[PDB]
Amino acid sequence: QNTLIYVVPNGSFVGSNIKLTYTTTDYAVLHYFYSTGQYKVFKTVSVPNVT
């Protein structure tokens, strides 16, 4: 119900990442914060460069 799964081939494993973009489910929030740039929020999860 709450799980997201990203699968990449062998060649795309290095730095395989997911970017989450959350948008308001509200018209007023889209309208009133278009200028400030805080009506949609994005973040990323990536495979760490590990030793």
């Binding site: 740039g37 805080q38 929020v41 994005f42 973040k43 990323t44």
Partner: protein
């Protein structure tokens, strides 16, 4: 309300940039090296004060208001002075040489929200300038008036802007009497003969930038030396010159093509007259000699080994009495002096033991 301003990252300034020659062939990169004391993190201003006042933990644009390139003797700057809203460019001498309307510097855009990495574009080029260096005929039999490297120029929006002499900024350089000569040089050869005086000109291109390494025979020559200063390498290994030897076998390593001829000059100082601790001569050389090295391939022509075995000859080794000495080998170029000498520029044997 003024609140926490937290900077979890800034711009990154590195070395070994992709070289762009002044010639039309820009896709060739001679090894460039921004000189000492340029350590990342430029100063730049946020594009929005109000958001940064609370927390700049999101996607932002950073207007660069400080770019510093430090050379050996000075440093040039390109900074967007927001007080006047003008891009001010100063050369290595520390004097304002350019003022440009608006922000011609690109605005470093963050790659991610609350990350700290800001990316833009920085181009560079070389604009030749004038600086006369005189090589006397007392050591080469032919005088050389050399116009030096030129001037390093930052290229913004496709337009170049000089930042002072590139000889101090860029590596390699060739030091003659403390004067640095690099690519885009111009050597006027003054030949003196029985007829009189003649003058010819050989221009050094931006593709004749050519690092050249001088190495001892017992030290690897196919492996670049990272432990060699820009001006010299002091080999502390013990060397004893037999009386049957009048030539010293050394290696000359070339990373870029080297078509023009030169010579290796050997300056012999007494061990007491040379300060091995600092590597600087405390007195005039007690002897001088030269060996003309005509740049020719050893193996296959053109595709020979990047290492040349040079027999540095001496115009009389019996002139120096047996004892302890320091011998400095320096590359002095002939007939259109090309660019050479990084890591090392000179080869200083500090423990020469001449025995006869």
């Amino acid at each position: 309300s003024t609140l926490s301003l937290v900077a979890k990252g800034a711009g990154v300034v590195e070395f070994l940039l992709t070289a762009y020659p002044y010639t039309g062939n820009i896709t060739f990169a001679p090894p460039w090296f921004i000189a000492e004391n340029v350590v990342k993190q430029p100063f730049m201003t946020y594009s929005d004060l109000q958001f940064a006042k609370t927390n700049p933990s999101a996607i932002l644009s950073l207007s660069t208001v400080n770019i510093t390139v430090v050379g050996l003797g000075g440093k040039a700057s390109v900074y967007y002075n927001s007080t006047s809203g003008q891009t001010v460019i100063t050369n290595i001498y520390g004097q304002t040489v350019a003022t440009l309307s608006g922000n011609v510097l690109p605005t470093l855009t963050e790659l991610a929200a609350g990350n700290g990495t800001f990316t833009g574009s920085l181009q560079f080029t070389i604009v030749p300038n004038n600086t006369v260096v005189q090589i006397p005929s007392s050591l080469t039999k032919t005088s050389f008036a050399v116009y030096t490297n030129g001037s390093l120029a930052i290229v913004l929006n496709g337009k170049a802007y000089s930042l002072g002499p590139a000889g101090l900024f860029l590596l390699p350089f060739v030091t003659y009497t403390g004067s640095a000569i690099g690519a885009n040089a111009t050597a006027i050869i003054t030949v003196s003969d029985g007829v009189g005086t003649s003058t010819t000109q050989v221009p050094i291109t931006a593709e004749n930038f050519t690092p050249i390494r001088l190495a001892p025979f017992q030290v690897p020559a196919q492996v670049p030396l990272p432990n060699a200063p820009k001006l010299k390498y002091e080999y502390n290994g013990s060397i004893v010159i037999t009386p049957q030897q009048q030539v010293l076998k050394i290696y000359v390593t070339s990373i870029l093509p080297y078509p023009q001829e030169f010579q290796i000059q050997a300056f012999v100082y007494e061990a007491s007259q040379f300060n091995v601790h600092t590597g600087s001569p405390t007195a005039a050389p007690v002897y001088f000699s030269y060996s003309a090295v005509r740049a020719y391939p050893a193996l296959g022509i053109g595709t020979s080994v990047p290492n040349l075995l040079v027999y540095v000859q001496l115009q009389g080794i019996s002139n120096l009495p047996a004892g302890k000495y320091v011998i400095v080998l320096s590359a002095v170029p002939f007939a259109g002096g090309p660019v050479l000498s990084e890591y090392p520029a000179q080869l200083i044997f500090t423990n020469v033991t001449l025995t006869q």
